[PDB]
């Protein structure tokens, strides 16, 4: 296992300049703890790596992220990483944000600096990352985040006017994502209102992206909890319908749900009434094997057939 | 003063005219001020003269007192009045400070000053002059009022309308108006350093402190909602800038949001986040989560500090900081709130680890004086000791000691309370920390002759500072030039007696700093007592040493354990076994445990190594006779080469007295047991080498010499000389290398030993003045080392 | 990128720098004022004067994403060749700005 890499030490570390990806696609895979694999981990983060040969020695320090002993080192890569994201590199945009998860995250120049690819947004998704890339670190120290957090929202929720939409959907993917930060979202919940209002008033396009105005009013739900029972029948009425325009509720699964999750239960089946034959309908028809699968749990999470 | 300083007013209605309540506001702002203070000349609608007569009035008023004095503008017609010469006439520690409430001219207004000034600055130098300095001007739909104006009163005030004030409010929500006032006792306390964040953020170096000048210039800060009108309401000031920015300014949004939930009703909270969320992660980057920052922080913990918060937190992460300094000491001091809460803070027990950790390092900071401090500390610090505890105190204690050594302010009486708790203590620490500590407590004591219960420990510690740790320590020996300070007056007279008693007691620590130390002015472990014994070797585990006797009885001494003669005048050998006890002499052999000879020009060196006997015979070829066959496998061949010594893993060593020291490849005499051949026959040293060190877990050669100095040397490739040693006037025997470290271990016919540095510098040396030192003995790892002289043997540690 | 029109890729990047120089500019824009940058490598060197200006507007208010971009800037003009002037004026000056 060890002089698999031992004289790879020369080879990963001097040039064979196409290749040392492969190189250092080993390496990943194993081990070899001496500490020659932390200067390894340093000096070909070094050089460092040039022209989209970088992704993976993006990757692999990350795969080789490890600790405690020389704390510079430490973030040092952190250091460079977070350096890194700007330069093009469209992925290696997501990539070293697609890792770390785990660790250390802190200095208070690194928020400052994390949150400014939050403030890319492009390319969307990259943003996606670190609201929750910051979920955890969120609640760590509010300090810095809760207010750039804060923010945040405050830049969001505006967007819900400004016309349409390909914007109001890159609403909906941020809008949950910071929720991996809790406390925050709870002590507003005015996303009810300016949501609640985004379904109803229609028809304003194909507005295919509803759907995922959807996932997030779910994913809130759970920390929404009680507090939550407002608004409801509301949507138990609008949801019971939009179950039955516009299609492919995939949603209507996971949402009414959280709902239920949120506990008006059986009762519902009087307000909205016909909910039984609405599932006793749909289950047959629908393959979608979470439609077939949820309904059960909607049925089941709901309800007790009286 | 109480209220600060002297202040103007003014308002504008038209001109030379009252008004229904127009005299009520007046004293609103004299409240305000006075809510931030100070003697306000209330005024309205004047025509110009009847201004400039209390400016004069208050440039009457006598502001040698005030810390500063105010000049109020506002909003009339556009009163033109007195462009330049009023104020320009009356212009540049009661400082002045003038105050423009304009649509345009607040600038011109400053743009008048600078200009009238660059007049009345360049233009009064030819009359060889009023001075620009300490007098500054700052400058200035449908919810108003007069924001400038209101600015600085109505600070959280006007801010709560900002708030309302729009887009934001819809979350926090809802608005209504007022009540809210001792959970807003926070809001200030908070908005207090909210803004001083980015103070400290932009400050660089203009600052405060001079208070109610501040209390604006933070007032001042609050003129970024600016936000209404394309011109943005941008005041000016030139005693900056960003506004805007500044994060704390975006973070007291969402610490509003904290405050709008519990105002709805019922108030109830309290609470609310801020400080605390901020004190969090202060340590973040106090641990390490900061590069250089700058601090990031410290600004917050000040006034963090104020409240019972926390406090301790804070405090607690006061004195992180004082572990991240030196460094960012200066930036605690940068802020200083220390010298301001820590000293602010006379009233610890539990803080006093804190009031030691935080303040103890402040006080550490090097320095300022205390000043009624001291007799705070006097009180707080002297009673720190009182529990006895922690080591916590073992120098914290001694913070303030030196303090009465630094000066008199006495520092003798306050100090002699002390004196009695002080040295009490201190043989009871024992502990050099504490007491190379509490020698400065000693030295607390400046001159003043005090008493015998001042002269009671005199002796008592005297003992202990007897006793110390490798007393030959030259740092004794200029520690002892020190109290001879007081000893310049001699001989005389009468604690000059029981002073020669003290004195002579420590003996001498000699060189070799005070090698150095001594024209400036101008452990020692175990001493046998008997004849003098050539070379002694004790065995491995037992302390049960051979040493080879001069009287030609090899004696035998756990440290009398046996004498033991085989041999004649001069037994100048012994070398124990490696795992037996069984040792060789000069050739007799014994084991310490039999205590009697095993086996018999004379061979004075001899050492068991292979299992080699390393010895140089002087039947001038070198006859190794290997004790277990006790025959020699190398003879070979002008002089007694002088030395056979294994070098350890791999090798040998010869020194001859022609000069020519002779590296040993002994490989085929170690193979067969070129039996004995020279490897670098090197004459630099004139003769026989003192020593030679093979280096133990290394090659390096060496010769030590009687020609007062030494040659380090490094043969690798080949022998060649590293670096010199020197300083000595007299005959070196030997030195050696420390085992793992490096020191050149050298002893001399002076019986003084030299621990020299690899430089090729003594940096330690002990010294015996009646020796000389022709033997001694090392153990590597754990280490007591036994040396000889004249007498006999002096084994040290 | 506009379409090709040449005038706006200066005249957007203009009435940025009129806003690049007043209130409420950097934090919350940063790589997408990085990213023309490149659109400045790319297509004509007229848009250098602007990029040489926009991207100068900015050095003066904020220095904290100055620093980062240190060295993507660095690079970015060497293939776009100018590596000059009053943008650099200012790298020097605020970086002097920062020794200041």
Redesign the interface.
């Known amino acids: 296992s060890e002089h698999k890499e031992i004289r790879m030490e020369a080879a990963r570390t001097c040039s064979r300049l196409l290749t040392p990806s492969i190189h250092l696609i080993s390496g990943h895979a194993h081990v070899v703890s001496q500490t020659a694999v932390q200067v390894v981990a340093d000096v070909l983060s070094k050089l460092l790596v040039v022209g989209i040969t970088d992704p993976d020695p993006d990757i692999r320090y990350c795969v080789l992220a490890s600790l405690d002993e020389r704390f510079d080192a430490h973030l040092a890569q952190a250091e460079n990483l977070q350096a890194l994201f700007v330069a093009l590199n469209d992925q290696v945009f997501e990539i070293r944000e697609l890792a770390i998860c785990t660790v250390g995250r802190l200095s208070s120049m690194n928020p400052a600096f994390v949150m400014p690819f939050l403030r890319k947004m492009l390319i969307q998704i990259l943003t996606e990352l670190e609201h929750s890339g910051i979920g955890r670190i969120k609640e760590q120290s509010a300090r810095m985040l809760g207010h750039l957090v804060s923010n945040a929202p405050r830049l969001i929720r505006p967007y819900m006017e400004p016309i349409l939409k390909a914007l109001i959907l890159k609403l909906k993917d941020p809008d949950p994502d910071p929720n991996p930060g809790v406390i925050n979202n709870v002590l507003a919940t005015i996303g009810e209102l300016a949501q609640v209002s985004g379904l109803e008033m229609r028809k304003w396009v194909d507005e295919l992206f509803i759907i995922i105005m959807d996932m997030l009013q779910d994913s809130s739900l759970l920390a929404k909890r009680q507090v939550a029972l407002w608004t409801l029948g509301q949507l138990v009425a609008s949801t019971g319908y939009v179950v039955e325009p516009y299609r492919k509720y995939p949603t209507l699964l996971e949402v009414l749900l959280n709902f239920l999750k949120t506990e008006q239960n059986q009762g519902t089946r009087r307000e909205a009434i016909r909910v039984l034959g609405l599932l006793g309908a749909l289950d047959p028809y629908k393959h979608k094997v979470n439609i077939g699968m949820i309904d059960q749990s909607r049925d089941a999470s709901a309800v007790s057939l009286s | 003063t109480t209220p600060c300083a002297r202040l103007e007013c003014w308002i504008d209605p038209l001109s030379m005219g009252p008004q229904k309540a127009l005299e009520t506001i007046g004293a609103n702002l004299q409240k305000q001020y006075e809510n931030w203070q100070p003697r306000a000349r209330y005024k309205q609608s004047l025509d110009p003269t009847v201004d400039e007569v209390k400016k004069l009035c208050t440039s009457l008023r006598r502001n040698a007192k005030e810390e500063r004095v105010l000049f109020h503008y506002n909003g009339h017609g556009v009163p033109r009045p007195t462009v330049n010469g009023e104020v320009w006439v009356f212009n540049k520690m009661g400082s002045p400070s003038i105050f423009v409430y304009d649509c345009s001219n607040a600038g011109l207004i400053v743009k008048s000053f600078k200009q009238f000034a660059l007049q009345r600055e360049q233009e009064l130098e030819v009359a060889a002059p009023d001075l620009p300095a300490d007098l500054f001007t700052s400058c200035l739909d449908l919810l108003v009022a007069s924001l400038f104006r209101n600015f600085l009163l109505a600070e959280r005030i006007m801010r709560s309308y900002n708030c309302t004030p729009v887009?934001?409010p819809?979350?926090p929500?809802t608005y209504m108006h007022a009540m809210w006032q001792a959970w807003d006792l926070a809001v200030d306390i908070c908005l207090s350093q909210l803004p001083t964040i980015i103070e400290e953020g932009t400050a660089f170096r203009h600052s405060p402190f001079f208070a109610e000048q501040l209390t604006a210039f933070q007032v001042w800060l609050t003129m970024g909602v600016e936000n209404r009108n394309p011109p943005?309401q941008l005041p000016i000031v030139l005693q900056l800038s960003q506004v805007?920015?500044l994060?704390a300014l975006?973070?007291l949004?969402?610490?509003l949001?904290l405050g709008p939930?519990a105002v709805s009703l019922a108030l109830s909270v309290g609470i609310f986040?801020y400080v605390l969320?901020?004190l969090?992660?202060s340590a973040?980057?106090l641990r390490?989560?900061?590069?250089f920052?700058w601090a990031?922080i410290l600004a917050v913990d000040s006034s963090c500090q104020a409240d019972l918060v926390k406090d301790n937190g804070h405090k607690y992460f006061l004195s992180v900081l004082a572990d991240p300094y030196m460094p960012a000491e200066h930036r605690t001091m940068t802020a200083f709130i220390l010298a301001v809460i820590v000293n602010s803070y006379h009233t610890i027990w539990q803080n006093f680890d804190s009031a030691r950790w935080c303040g103890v390092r402040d006080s550490a900071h090097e320095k300022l004086y205390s000043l009624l401090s001291d007799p705070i500390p006097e009180v707080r610090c002297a009673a720190v000791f009182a529990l006895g505890t922690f080591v916590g105190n073992s120098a914290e204690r001694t913070d303030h000691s030196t303090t009465i050594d630094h000066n008199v302010a006495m520092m003798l009486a306050q100090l002699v309370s002390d004196g009695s708790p002080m040295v009490r203590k201190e043989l009871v620490v024992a502990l050099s920390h504490l007491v190379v500590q509490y020698e400065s407590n000693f030295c607390t004591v400046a001159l003043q002759f005090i008493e015998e219960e001042k002269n009671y420990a005199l002796p008592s510690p005297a003992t202990t500072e007897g006793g110390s740790l490798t007393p030959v320590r030259d740092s004794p020996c200029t520690p002892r030039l020190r109290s001879v300070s007081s000893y310049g007056n001699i001989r005389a007279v009468a604690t000059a007696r029981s002073l020669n008693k003290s004195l002579q007691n420590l003996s001498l620590t000699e060189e070799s700093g005070g090698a150095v130390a001594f024209s400036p002015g101008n452990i020692l472990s175990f001493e046998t007592i008997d004849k003098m014994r050539r070379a002694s070797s004790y065995s491995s585990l037992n302390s049960l040493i051979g040493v080879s006797f001069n009287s030609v009885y090899t004696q035998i001494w756990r440290v009398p354990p046996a004498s033991s003669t085989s041999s004649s005048s001069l037994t100048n050998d012994v070398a124990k076994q490696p795992v037996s006890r069984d040792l060789p002499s000069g050739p007799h052999s014994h084991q310490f445990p039999r205590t009697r000879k095993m086996f018999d020009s004379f061979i004075s060196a001899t050492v068991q190594t292979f299992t080699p006997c390393i010895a140089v015979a002087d039947k001038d070829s070198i006859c190794f006779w290997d004790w277990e066959k006790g025959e020699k496998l190398d003879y070979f061949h002008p002089r007694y080469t002088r030395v056979t010594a294994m070098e350890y893993l791999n090798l040998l060593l010869t020194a001859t007295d022609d000069g020519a020291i002779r590296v040993w490849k002994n490989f085929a005499d170690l193979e067969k047991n070129a039996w004995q051949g020279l490897s670098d026959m090197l004459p630099t040293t004139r003769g026989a080498g003192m020593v030679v060190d093979w280096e133990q877990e290394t090659g390096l050669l060496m010769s030590s010499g009687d020609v007062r100095i030494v040659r380090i040397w490094d043969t690798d490739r080949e022998m060649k000389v590293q670096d010199i040693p020197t300083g000595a006037d007299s005959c070196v025997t030997s030195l050696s290398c420390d085992s793992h470290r490096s020191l050149i271990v050298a002893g001399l016919g002076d019986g003084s030993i030299r621990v020299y540095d690899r430089w090729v510098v003594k940096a330690s040396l002990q010294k015996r003045p009646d020796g000389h030192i022709v033997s001694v003995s090392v153990n590597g790892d754990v280490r007591i080392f036994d040396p000889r002289m004249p007498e006999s043997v002096n084994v040290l540690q | 990128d506009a379409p090709e029109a040449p005038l706006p890729s200066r005249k957007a990047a203009l009435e940025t720098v009129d806003r690049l120089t007043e209130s409420l500019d950097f934090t919350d824009y940063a790589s997408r004022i990085i990213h023309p940058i490149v659109r400045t490598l790319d297509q004509s060197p007229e848009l250098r004067s602007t990029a040489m200006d926009t991207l100068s507007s900015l050095v003066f208010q904020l220095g904290k994403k100055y620093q980062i971009f240190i060295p993507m800037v660095n690079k970015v003009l060497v293939r776009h060749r100018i590596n000059h002037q009053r943008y650099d004026v200012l790298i020097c000056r605020i970086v002097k700005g920062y020794t200041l």
């Open positions: 887009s934001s819809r979350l929500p943005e805007h920015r994060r975006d973070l949004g969402r610490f949001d939930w986040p969320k901020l969090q992660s973040r980057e390490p989560l900061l590069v920052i990031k």
